[PDB]
Structure formats: C-alpha cells, structure tokens
Amino acid sequence: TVENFLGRSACVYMEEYKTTDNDVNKKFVAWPINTKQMVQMRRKLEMFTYLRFDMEVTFVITSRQDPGTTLAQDMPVLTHQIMYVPPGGPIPAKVDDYAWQTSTNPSIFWTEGNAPARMSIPFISIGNAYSNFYDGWSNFDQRGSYGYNTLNNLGHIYVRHVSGSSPHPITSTIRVYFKPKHTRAWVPRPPRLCQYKKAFSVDFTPTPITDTRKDINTVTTV
C-alpha cells in the first residue's frame, strides 16, 4: 500500500557541527528543508507526482572527540537545540545569537544518552498537495527559476550545542529522518532511471534502457 511503501524512516540529511572552532559557521547547522539530497527517499517520493501526508521526524545525533596531541578532558553530557525557522523568521548568524530564544519558533532541547528526539508535523503545504515536480517558471514572463525548486519554501532547520564549548573540540553529526504517515498519492510516474546529478533539478546524463545480452535467444548464464 502506498502508506506502507513510504512509511519507513529514511535519512534525508546529515551534517556536522563542532563544539569549538575558530570558524563561526563550523559550530552550527543551517539546513533548507527539502527531500532531494538523499537519493533513496527521493526516488520513492518521485514515483508519484503529488503527495499529501503528515510527517514524523526523528533525529539521530552522535558526538566524537576530535583527534589531537592532548585529549585529556572531562566534559559533562552535551545538550543540543534543534530549531525550526518558518520562511521569513530571523536566522541565527552564530551559536550565541538572540534568535535562539525561540519565543515562537518550535525547538527541541535534547540530551545525549537518551532515546532519539522525535515529533510530528502536519501537512503544511500552501497548496492542496506537495508537488514532486513542477514544469513551470516563477515569473509570469516564463522566466526566473524553472522546476520544482520554485515551490520549495518549507523553511530551515538550525541546530547548535547549547552551552557546550569544550577545551578540546568535539564533533557532533546530526542525521534527520523523515517518515510520511496518513499518506495519499496521485498520478504515478516511471521510476528515475538515470542517476541523480543535482539536488534542485531533474538534470541527468543519458543512460541506456537496460543492459544487453549477446543475442535475442540467449537464455543461459555462461
């Protein structure tokens, strides 16, 4: 059933953020939510043109101490903050900025050693169904952006360590899983044959129909 086929958590993104680093941007993640960067999930969703579902999101966060000459330290357990910033909200420029107050945006505070964080999001499109493809433009002129990317404005996910500055750097990796539930799908399409080349475009390199055999009667293996 489509509910069953799509209803398993799949990794849709992963990135690293350090506990301490000279580069401000290496200390937090800023991800523009989408389902086009991880090949497996993408191919499945793309078997349908339109989809409507609620979404279960699970996060798997792991930390490792960076290698170095002096590693002796005794760091207490780490706590992470995952904040969702709907389109247009203030975006954090550094781990310690005001935006992390989340007076209105939804955030999750999670501590290592515990069950992975999780929550449900309802069907949030401004349309009646999510579009996996969009054969059109952003401008009425028939110019601007072309393709599904023009309809992607789900916002961002921002994640940082709470007050985790450690003497020697620790690198955390966050993995985000999506599991659609209460699903409906319309107008099915042929599965993607060519390998994916870009995250935000259908772009591909011609690939042959299938593999070949010596003649039209060959039926043996050797």
Partner: protein, 252 residues
C-alpha cells in the same frame, strides 16, 4: 455501429466513421470549479460557446521515417480566437479539453500511433545542467519533434524518442490517458482530459498542464500507391473554461 461518432461543442461538430471508443481522463469528466474548492474570490467569466468550441491546429505529415511529435497545453491554443484572448486578459484560468487526433490512410497502409496526454511533462535538457528556453518546448500551435539520435544541441530538450524527453521508458507511457490509432482499425482518437493540477486554478502561460504526444510505435508503410505522406491533424476543444483576475492583456 459504435464506430460512428458525432461531437458538438459551440458552433462546431466533429464526425468519425471509423473510431475506437472515447477515453475520458481518469474517468473524470470536465467540470466547473465548486464553491468549496475555490480560493480566488472574484466572480469568474465563463465565455461558454465563444471559447468552448473546436480549434484545428496546423496539420503535419506522417512519413515512413517520422519518429514522433508533442504539443504543450494550453500554450498550443494561445492564439486561438477568444480562448487565447481570455488567456491574455486573465491572471488565472481553468479548463478541460476534448482532443481529437485525425489520421486516415487506406486498407493497404499499415502503421500505429500512440496518442497520450502526459500531465506535468517536465523535460530534461539536451546537455545535462544546461538550461534551455521556453522556445525549446512550445510556441503557439507549432508541432515539436522527437529524434532517434540523442540530442547534442544544448538549446534543445533531450529529444531521443525512447525516453520521451522525461527519462522514463517510452513503452510505459500507457499509464496516462491514451488511445492508439492502428491504421488497420482506426482513423482517429478522442481523449477528454479533465483539469488536473495541485491547485484549483493556475496561470495559463506560465504552466503547461499537460503535453499531447503522438508517437509512431509501428512505422508508416505502404506499397506502390501514388499517395506518399499521410497527414495527421489535431482538433481540440476547451471545456468548462473559466477565468479569474481580469487586468491588462499580457503582451505575448
């Protein structure tokens, strides 16, 4: 017989002496937008007979070596009478269509065409990564053609027929509303497409709702007949056309 068929919309009537059936969308007959499915609040225009009538596009030649053609809608009808005029003056539009593909030969000719309507027929570029312009896929009622060889011209779409410009298997296009014109039995194909989109109405210039593809799966062949090419003509009628958001006409 049932082979006999007559269709009347507005001031035009179509007749066929040798047809198959009439394929209807996904079993869905065209219909006006209901109050419980609308967002745009202004009172719409429903020109009726002035727009919902049959328009015949320029004809084309099916030759022994032809490979296939496509037309994108509503673009293909942008110059057709009041239908085109209404498209220009309105921000939003909505319509279904009766598509009638005509092709007569003789009892001694052979050949077979697939007539399909592909919703959201988003296409790939001739060279991956290279953007192309609208002109590479639609321009009034001009028929675009597929090719056997893979396309090299970066200003074009990847026209290699076996992947139908979409990266899928051409023999699987049958999951979309379609009919076959097998010269041996048919002489035309009629498909009624309802409005299919993820939003209730949409801009008619900026979005090609569906693409009509006519593909020879079995090549045109004949013996010592004086006739050479076999013409293919497409006649289409908008159904339940309604428009919202009137303002100045779009220049093109």
């Amino acid at each position: 017989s049932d082979r006999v068929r007559s269709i009347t919309l507005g001031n035009s009537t179509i007749t066929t002496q040798e047809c198959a059936n009439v394929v209807v969308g996904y079993g869905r007959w065209p219909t006006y937008l209901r109050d419980d499915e609308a967002t745009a609040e202004d009172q719409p225009t429903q020109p009726d007979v002035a727009t919902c009538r049959f328009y015949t596009l320029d004809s084309i030649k099916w030759e022994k070596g032809s490979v296939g053609w496509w037309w994108k809608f509503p673009e293909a009808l942008s110059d057709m009478g009041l239908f085109g005029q209404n498209m220009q003056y309105h921000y939003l539009g909505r319509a279904g269509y009766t598509i009638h593909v005509q092709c007569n030969a003789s009892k001694f000719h052979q050949g077979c065409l697939l007539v399909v309507c592909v919703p959201e027929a988003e296409m790939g570029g001739a060279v991956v990564g290279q953007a192309f312009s609208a002109t590479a896929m639609a321009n009034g009622d001009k028929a675009y053609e597929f090719t056997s060889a893979t396309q090299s011209d970066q200003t074009k779409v990847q026209t290699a027929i076996h992947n139908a410009g979409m990266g899928v298997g051409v023999g699987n296009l049958t999951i979309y509303p379609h009919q076959w014109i097998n010269l041996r039995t048919n002489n035309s194909a009629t498909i009624v497409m309802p409005y299919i989109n993820s939003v209730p109405m949409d801009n008619m210039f900026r979005h090609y709702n569906f693409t009509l593809m006519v593909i020879p799966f079995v090549k045109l062949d004949y013996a010592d007949t004086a006739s050479t090419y076999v013409p293919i003509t497409v006649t289409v009628a908008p159904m339940c056309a309604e428009y919202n958001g009137l303002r100045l006409a779009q220049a093109q």
